[PDB]
Each structure stands twice: as C-alpha cells, then as structure tokens.
Amino acid sequence: KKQILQAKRIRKNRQEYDALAKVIQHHPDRHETLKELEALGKELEHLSHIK
C-alpha cells in the first residue's frame, strides 16, 4: 500500500513533466537559436557599420 501510493505520486510527477515538455516542444530549439542570433548579431553589426 505504501509503495503503490508513492508509485502513483511519481506517476503524477512524470505526467506533469511530460505536460510541460510537450508545450516546450512546440517551440524551436535553444542552441540553434543561439547560433542564428549570433549570425544575426554579426550581420546587424556589419549593416550598422555600413549604415
């Protein structure tokens, strides 16, 4: 009884984790966004110097 109460609590925690992770996976990645932000920042600095 005690182990099955703890098991259902851990199952609820896993379902909360999956519920947040599914919403995160509707958004694009993190590191690829950092790479394209670095590229856009370099291009914006070059365009600002040209302007």
Binding site: P28, L40, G41, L44, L47, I50
Partner: protein, 46 residues
C-alpha cells in the same frame, strides 16, 4: 527563455529589415548626391 529568444530574434529580424531599408534608401540618397556633384562639376576663369 525560448520565448525571450524567439521574441528577440523577431526583433533582430525587424532591425535587420530596418538596416536594409536604411541602406537601400541611403544608397539611393548617395546616388542622388553623386548626380548633384556631377551637375555641379558640369556647371563649373578656373
């Protein structure tokens, strides 16, 4: 954090479009200035 990076990337896209608009218009202005200079040279004793 992904919300912040997505919104800041959209802001950087808008800023890059503005830099391109500034540059395009700026280039046109420069071209006009060159024509004006040419006209002045033609007008140009010495």
């Amino acid at each position: 954090q992904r919300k912040r990076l997505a919104e800041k990337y959209r802001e950087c896209l808008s800023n890059k479009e503005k830099i391109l608009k500034e540059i395009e218009v700026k280039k046109e202005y420069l071209s006009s200035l060159q024509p004006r200079l040419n006209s002045i040279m033609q007008a140009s004793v010495q």
